[PDB]
């Protein structure tokens, strides 16, 4: 039976592509200093 | 099969959570899983714990308590999932998240 029938898989062809997201750039600053009225 | 209770992942390189003692709620083993495969806090909220045994999830503040005779094997695993996600399906809309004034 399928001996005589052959197919590439139809899952194999690609196009478009695809694109998550990557990251977050870490940043923060600190500068603090506190006193008293 | 020996006493204790053991976390489960899918990844190899990761090495299982081990517990002796404490007293933990579902939450704090969750970021703590997360924390340890590194995952962004953007996307932990989409993970939960599940119990193959029982076939059953665990409440985010459920109270799991040890007795140095409970033992157990937990699995931390991603739940809830929206189909089409992706942009390769064309016969339908895709998803994204919202962006401040291309999708995200």
Redesign the interface.
């Known amino acids: 039976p399928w001996f005589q029938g052959v197919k590439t898989p139809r899952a194999l062809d690609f196009s478009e592509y695809r694109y998550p997201v990557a990251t977050f750039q870490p940043s923060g600053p600190e500068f603090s200093d506190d006193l008293i009225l | 099969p020996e006493p204790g209770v053991e976390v489960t992942f899918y990844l190899l390189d990761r090495e299982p959570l081990r517990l002796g003692s404490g007293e933990y709620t579902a939450e704090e083993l969750c970021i703590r899983a997360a924390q340890e495969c590194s995952i962004?806090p953007?996307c932990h909220n989409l993970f939960a714990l599940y119990d193959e045994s029982t076939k059953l999830w665990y409440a985010p503040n459920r109270i799991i308590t040890v007795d140095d005779k409970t033992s157990l094997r937990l699995h931390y695993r991603m739940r809830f999932y929206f189909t089409n996600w992706?942009?390769?399906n064309d016969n339908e809309q895709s998803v994204w998240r919202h962006s401040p004034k291309e999708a995200?």
């Open positions: 962004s953007l992706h942009g390769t995200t």
